[PDB]
Amino acid sequence: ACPRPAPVPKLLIKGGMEVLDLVTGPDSVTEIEAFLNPRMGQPPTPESLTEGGQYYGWSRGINLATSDTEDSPENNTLPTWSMAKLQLPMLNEDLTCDTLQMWEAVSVKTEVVGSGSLLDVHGFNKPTDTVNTKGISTPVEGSQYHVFAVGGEPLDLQGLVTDARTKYKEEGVVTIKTITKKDMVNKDQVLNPISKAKLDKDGMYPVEIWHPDPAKNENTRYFGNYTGGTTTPPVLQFTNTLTTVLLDENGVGPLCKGEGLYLSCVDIMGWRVTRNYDVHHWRGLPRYFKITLRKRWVKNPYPMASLISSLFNNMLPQVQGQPMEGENTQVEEVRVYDGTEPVPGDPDMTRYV
Amino acid sequence: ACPRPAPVPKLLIKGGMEVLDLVTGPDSVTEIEAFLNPRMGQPPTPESLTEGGQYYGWSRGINLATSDTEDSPENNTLPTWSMAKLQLPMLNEDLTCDTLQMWEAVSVKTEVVGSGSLLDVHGFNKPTDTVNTKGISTPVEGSQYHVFAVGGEPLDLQGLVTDARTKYKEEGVVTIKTITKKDMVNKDQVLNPISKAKLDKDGMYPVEIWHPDPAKNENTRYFGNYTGGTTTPPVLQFTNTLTTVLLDENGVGPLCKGEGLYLSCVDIMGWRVTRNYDVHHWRGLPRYFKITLRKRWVKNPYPMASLISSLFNNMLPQVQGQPMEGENTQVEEVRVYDGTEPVPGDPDMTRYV
Amino acid sequence: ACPRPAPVPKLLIKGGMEVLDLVTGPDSVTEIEAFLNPRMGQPPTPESLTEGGQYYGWSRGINLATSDTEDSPENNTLPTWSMAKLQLPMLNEDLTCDTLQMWEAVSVKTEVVGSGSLLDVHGFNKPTDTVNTKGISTPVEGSQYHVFAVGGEPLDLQGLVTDARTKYKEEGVVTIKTITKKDMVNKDQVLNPISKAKLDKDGMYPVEIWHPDPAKNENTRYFGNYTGGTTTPPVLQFTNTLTTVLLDENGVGPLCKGEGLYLSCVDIMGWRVTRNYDVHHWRGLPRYFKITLRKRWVKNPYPMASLISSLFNNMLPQVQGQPMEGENTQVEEVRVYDGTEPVPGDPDMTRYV
Amino acid sequence: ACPRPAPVPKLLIKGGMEVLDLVTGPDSVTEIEAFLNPRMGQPPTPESLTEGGQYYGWSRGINLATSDTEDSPENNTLPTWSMAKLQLPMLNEDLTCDTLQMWEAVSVKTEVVGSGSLLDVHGFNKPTDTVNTKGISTPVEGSQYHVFAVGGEPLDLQGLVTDARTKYKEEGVVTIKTITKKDMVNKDQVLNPISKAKLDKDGMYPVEIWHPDPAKNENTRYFGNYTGGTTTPPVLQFTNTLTTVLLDENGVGPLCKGEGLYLSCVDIMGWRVTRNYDVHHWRGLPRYFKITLRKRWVKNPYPMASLISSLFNNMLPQVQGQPMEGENTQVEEVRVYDGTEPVPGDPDMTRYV
Amino acid sequence: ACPRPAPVPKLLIKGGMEVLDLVTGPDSVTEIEAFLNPRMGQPPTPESLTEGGQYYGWSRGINLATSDTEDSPENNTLPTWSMAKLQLPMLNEDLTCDTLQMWEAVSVKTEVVGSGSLLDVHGFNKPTDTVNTKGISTPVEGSQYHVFAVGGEPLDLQGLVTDARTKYKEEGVVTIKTITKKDMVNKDQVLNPISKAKLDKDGMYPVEIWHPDPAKNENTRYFGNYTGGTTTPPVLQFTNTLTTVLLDENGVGPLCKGEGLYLSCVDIMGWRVTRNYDVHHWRGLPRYFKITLRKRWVKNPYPMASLISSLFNNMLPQVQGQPMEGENTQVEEVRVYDGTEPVPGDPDMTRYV
């Protein structure tokens, strides 16, 4: 006799991360809304807007090379990767019949926030009438670079650079020399399979050195786009309604290793030009993530009965011995036999080219 | 024996908002056509086209900063948000079996009107042959910014700015300082979760400070796009035939809280340049909305038997006491028990990192 | 025993409009191919290519404003709307059981013709090497504006302008002052719901004043796009194979009121620059329409037994009396009762805000 | 017991056009791969690369008009249409039950070849540092124009021009004056329904005069796109995998009249600028077609028993007599009666406007 | 009683190419991840970053032509094609019932790596303020050219050039003169069906001479796009989630001839400009391929009982004799008869035009 409203998913509880401390069930869905600020040059710590003008959100400046051979980019001028790790609660286990529950990033709604800010055409930027210093304050223009990644483990990065003779500072930034303790080689200018790293720190990996690794990220979905030039107009489309599916060919999506969910981001909008000279502070805007996660039963990867193994590995000493791994390995050959075949003829035949 | 025309929806009555005073039924559909004018600088009140030339639809001018440290943007030069609230009639209630009827925005047909106006190449604008002051009057160019929102409650805004040392006037405009009574901090240049507001006024929230909040608007669908630059050609596509679906993942769409339907808009097309100097009045065009609404049975959110509660709250005094909420809350812990579990071991275990 | 060709629609007769004088049947389909020439400045009448060079297809020139306050655009420089009305034959009627047959525009294939003409880089236009007057004759560039509409009644236009102090000539052009006999107000610069008109004349409504009305055209499908700038390259895609569906949400499409089918068009490609000065004649190309129509049984809208009413209205005089309509109406209230409700309490309750 | 490979269409024979001399059957499919070279100015005949540098593939130059009134475009500077006709074999006929077999173009895979050639930045073109004549040789830029057509009969062209006072040479080129023996009128600058032609010659119809006729081509599918400007960067996308469907609304596609298949093409990429002056040779690239054809049973259009008619028409003389066709026709009225209707009232009623 | 995880494909073994030495089965799927470095000018061999600055990844420079007639492009300045061949293992054969197994490229995931590197605006490039040599180091801009191909045989190339009087070096590069031992003709500037080659070498075929052949590649899927200009901003979109289907109309995709899988690539991003002059080194980025292959049963193409034939061909001498093939062939006619037709009339009738 009464009207029936339409069925919608029932919201049990909402709030902060504390809400995740409620044991819900196997088919419960969790939506986490977070944001990442642009780690582009100036750090957030000196909150006083008088040191230089609080370039938080911008770089500190830019210094061209003094000659073809020595370049020092002055870390507070290099835009870097933003990252965060959301720590989710633990789930059920099934040690009897080896099986485990973990979080599974199902969808993401992402949005770059604050593009209207670039409609600020007053201010002390290089004017449009440079001969009379009037007109409007030139807005942000130039190269744009928008990458975001959602994963269950830190984003794998690959090292690739322009001029490999660049001398980056050796602290406060993670470069190729920091990972491979040697210098940078010419192969670092195209693709070196050894210039690999992970995005564990925030504000430390510059985006002009470290790019999302295409060969590696299998628990991570990353989306990026680049636009070059010096006066390229920025373009941003924000919307409440579009969502990205994080599922893969098998319909799984990023499983949160351990219990963490990693968000990586960089959103460079272009440059600002000052008035006395042509200093070219970068501009970056924050990114909003809304990740929709569910619970999935997976097969337990670790036979943590290997604790016994760990036992025999902590009590037994650390031996060096002679190389049995690497390139100078002294292992000649390893063969594995399982069944019984008919007697072969010449047993050593392969691809014959 | 007679031919049968095709069945179409039957139009009961059409006219103004007065038409909504007719009790129609549960499956009646209502289409409301309205428009919003650009609140870009000059207000509509001085209708005389002689004060400065009636910049209604344009800004009053633009004033660059006098130095890096003091910026005063002179409110009549800041494009702001346009908003309107259409008041719909009341619907049925079901106090016996708690249930209520409210309006539900199902679709919207929106269109920016007057793009052909920008084909006016006569007039006293900066000519294309600046050395002989001939050619054509330079048309509107520059940064474009098109946002529109349809919701059941006012659009939630988030504060984000360029230079945070800007000194906006303290009346006739709503800035971040107006909402958070303190000054603007460096965090206001990237993302401060406290610089939140709502779009209740019209012509008061500048679009260079206030952006659609991605974390908040759940009864509101907003669509925006930005294009930077100084000479970027405007691009507009108007059409009679395209319509936007306002339904969400559950197939609901914006429910009109109370009975109001909120339309928010900003459509900046670029700048005009004057002749004697390079003054850079903004340009904005009106937006036409056609919202298609139906009636939906929902579950009554308020147990307005809480009127009794309101009773005990109006008679009982207003106490201050000691803080039990906030950050200096003196509440140590709150526990909720409902059922009976087996006796746990250590009852305090969480995500272990 | 014979091979069977595939069934295709059978062409009864083809030719000119005379062909429509053949009574075909209820499920016959008619395809009409027509074209509209650009009404952009110079009229077609002085066919001699010696007056100024026969700018037919171009404007006559351009004259910037002499000051901020007086602008006279010299009608032969304003691009205007092109329109045509194709008169279709009468159809059957069903006066016994009130029902009528009318034409129904089902599809349209449209195409702007002559874009290759803009590959004419010889000629006396402003050269690309302006210091030596060599290179190529600068081709057509600038703002483009492409609108076309197919309807059963004339296209409804809405008035919107740039500077409202512009003094358009009072004959040979239809402006806002022509429709509303007063001058233009500041509201005419954003949106005035009274600056409405219809596209009945051809070459008389300038496209910088009159835009397709979004609130009105319900028997008309219009499609437009605008591109600003001063040197924006034109872009045109012509094709034999694409067709636009004119049906609406109910699957009807434009019904031809009376028996006419109205085609409206404007296709501005940009400007040409002359050599001695920077005169900026517009350029426009013709548009080809191929409209596919069928017959539809509709419900007869007019109870032309109201001829009797018309009787009593032609014999009875024209009275003025006191205002019963308008804003100064002397009608206090009108109530309509049809059935019998239970006795209400307070009968005057509405939306309570 | 053996594995079964997947079924694919069986290739009977491949080679040149000679292969088509094999009577295959009714459901055989034929794929023909051909190419068309750009007929842009310089003809292919003087193969020596010393006359001027062998501009084959480019124009010979460009000559601006000497005044507003006399323009002579010097035929070897006008890009023209490329066309070819592939002659297919004859098929079966069914004179007993009137029916005929003809070829039917079902799909096309087309591709512009040689876009990488425009990466040649060495050479004697206008440098990028014009004050020191260094940098790179400016690559091809400017207006691009890409049209291709596949049909069963020659492509129908419509005449449309810029300035109609242009004096084209009267041999080696087909202009509007060549088809209509009179001069060009102002109507030739917008749309003259009499400036019609067909694409029978190759390298003779300039693309700045002759455009694909939208009203005519019904056995031809044409696709074109134009991009204006003077420095517009070329854009080309070549791919092995995309194919265009040539079928129409009835699912037929171009039937090869007689037995020929007509390919029409023009691919202009922009200009090259020389060094001593700003001569602006055009650039064009070849186009590759891969047309997929099948056989279709159609109804025989000609009752070639009309050979008897042709008999009585070759023996009987050629009379002039008085005009019975045209505009001065002396035929007053023609009426056709077939059945018997009830006696009408006024028999002369039409569309009453 | 236990939860069931979702079924996913089971990974037998992963590692290097050695992993392919495991006989898996008929429905096993193999995913190979590889990369190709840009072969753009400077070779990889002089690894010392002191010769000129290690332009590995860039060209060595650029030298304009000294006159219209002599051009020498200095091989280390020409971007060339990158290629690789992955050698896969041998599969099963079915000599009894003629049938063979071969690898079949089913999908590809490709990505250009290192676009963020172009955000390096420090360094010794031409500054943006050229009058004060300040601002930023101009980033990579200009013509972009992105082609990639996946096939079972080497990519077939077609020769097409700009100026055919260019004198390329006769070693270290493969030009049209290298393949056709004669010089280049004017036909080489549009399309010569004899200027064909194959991509067997890497870093030897310049992309300004050799383009993917549209008539030839049937076991190869290639995708390319070109963007001209001198300051065109680069645009790159990298993503983890998109994959290209290599299957064709029959649903087969590239079959690996022999056992090799050929990857071809070129990714030019634009130029870098130096400071003292306007030298214009190219820029190229590596490409990552992830090819997904399966096994397919095909029909054995070679009747290698033709070994017997090969027998009679190695023992029998090499005769010259008189031409029986070519253009001066002395074979008059070859006829093939198989069945018995009714006696024809005139047996020599063909397409009659």
Numbering used by the authors:
A (entry chain F5), B (entry chain F1), C (entry chain F2), D (entry chain F3), E (entry chain F4): 18 to 370
Copy text verbatim from the article accompanying this structure deposition:
MuPyV and JCPyV are non-enveloped, circular dsDNA viruses with capsids ~45 nm in diameter. The β strands (BIDG and CHEF) are connected by flexible loops (BC, DE, EF, and HI) that extend outward from the surface of the capsomer and comprise the majority of the VP1 hypervariable regions. VP1 C-terminal extensions interact to link capsomers together forming the T = 7 d icosahedron.
Refinement of both datasets produced maps at 3.9 Å and 4.2 Å resolution for the A2 and A2-Fab complex, respectively. After icosahedral refinement, we next proceeded with local sub-particle refinement of the constituent hexavalent and pentavalent capsomers for each dataset. This sub-particle refinement allows each capsomer additional degrees of freedom to move independently of the rigid icosahedral matrix, which compensates for imperfect icosahedral symmetry present in flexible virus capsids. Sub-particle refinement improved the resolution of the pentavalent and hexavalent capsomers for both the A2 and A2-Fab complex (2.9 and 3.2 Å, respectively). For each dataset, the constituent capsomers attained approximately equal resolution. Our implementation of sub-particle refinement allowed the rapid solution of the highest resolution cryo-EM structures of any polyomavirus map to date.
